[PDB]
From Swiss-Prot:
The gene is Crhr2. The chain holds residues 36 to 101 of 411 of the full protein. Belongs to the G-protein coupled receptor 2 family. Coiled coil: none annotated. This is Corticotropin-releasing factor receptor 2. Glycans are attached at N18, N51, N63, N71. Monomer. Interacts with CRF, UCN, UCN2 and UCN3.
């Protein structure tokens, strides 16, 4: 998993979404205040191995944080 909350060097970008980790093995770094980020759907996290097409739309609260949206509702078990 990913940790820490900074960029390549000390003191770089402005207030952005904190580099976090959600339910799936997806690390969400500095995106943009009020910006929706997309990532591929789960590939190998369960006993099933398939469904390599859907994605995961995550929103970045304008306040400078991360949301718990994702595209699970329209994805598949995995």
């Amino acid at each position: 998993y990913c940790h820490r909350t900074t960029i390549g060097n000390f003191s770089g970008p402005y207030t952005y979404c904190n580099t976090t980790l959600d339910q799936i093995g997806t690390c969400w770094p500095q995106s943009a205040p009020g910006a929706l980020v997309e990532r591929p759907c789960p590939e190998y996290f369960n006993g099933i191995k398939y469904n390599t097409t859907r994605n995961a739309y995550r929103e970045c609260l304008e306040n400078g944080t991360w949301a718990s949206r994702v595209n699970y509702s329209h994805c598949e078990p995995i």
